[PDB]
Amino acid sequence: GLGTARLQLVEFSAFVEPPDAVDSYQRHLFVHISQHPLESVDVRQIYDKFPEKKGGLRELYDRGPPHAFFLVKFWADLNWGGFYGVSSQYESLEHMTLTCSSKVCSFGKQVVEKVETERAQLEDGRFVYRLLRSPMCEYLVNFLHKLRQLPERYMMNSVLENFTILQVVTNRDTQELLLCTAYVFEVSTSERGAQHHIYRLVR
Ligand SMILES: *C(#N)N1[C][C]2[C][C][C][C]([N]C3=[C][C]=[C][C]=C3C(F)(F)F)[C]2[C]1
Domain ranges of the chain: 8-201
Alpha-carbon gap, residue 84 to 27, rounded angstroms: 10
46's torsion region: left (phi>0), alpha (psi -120 to 50) or beta? alpha
How was this structure determined? It was done by X-ray
Collapse the DSSP code of 83 into the 3-class scheme (helix H, G, I; strand E, B; otherwise coil) and give the result. Answer: strand
CATH of 8-201, one of 1.10.10.10, 2.70.50.80, 3.30.365.10, 2.40.50.100: 2.70.50.80
CA 137 to ligand 1 center in whole angstroms: 8
Q: What is the resolution of this structure in A?
A: 2.8
Helices 153-160 & 138-148, crossing angle to 10 degrees? 150
The residues, any chain, with a CB within 8 Å of residue 96's CB and separated by 6 or more, are 120, 127, 171, 172, 173, 174, 178
Alpha carbon 202 to chain centroid distance? 19
Question: Residues 181, 4: contact at Cβ < 8 Å?
Answer: no
Which helix (H) or strand (E) covers residue 182, if one does?
strand 177-187
Centre of ligand 1 from the C-alpha of residue 29, in Å = 13
- For ligand 1, say whether the CB of 144 is within 6 Å of any of its atoms: no
Residue nearest to atom 1 of ligand 1 (CA): 137
SS3 89: strand
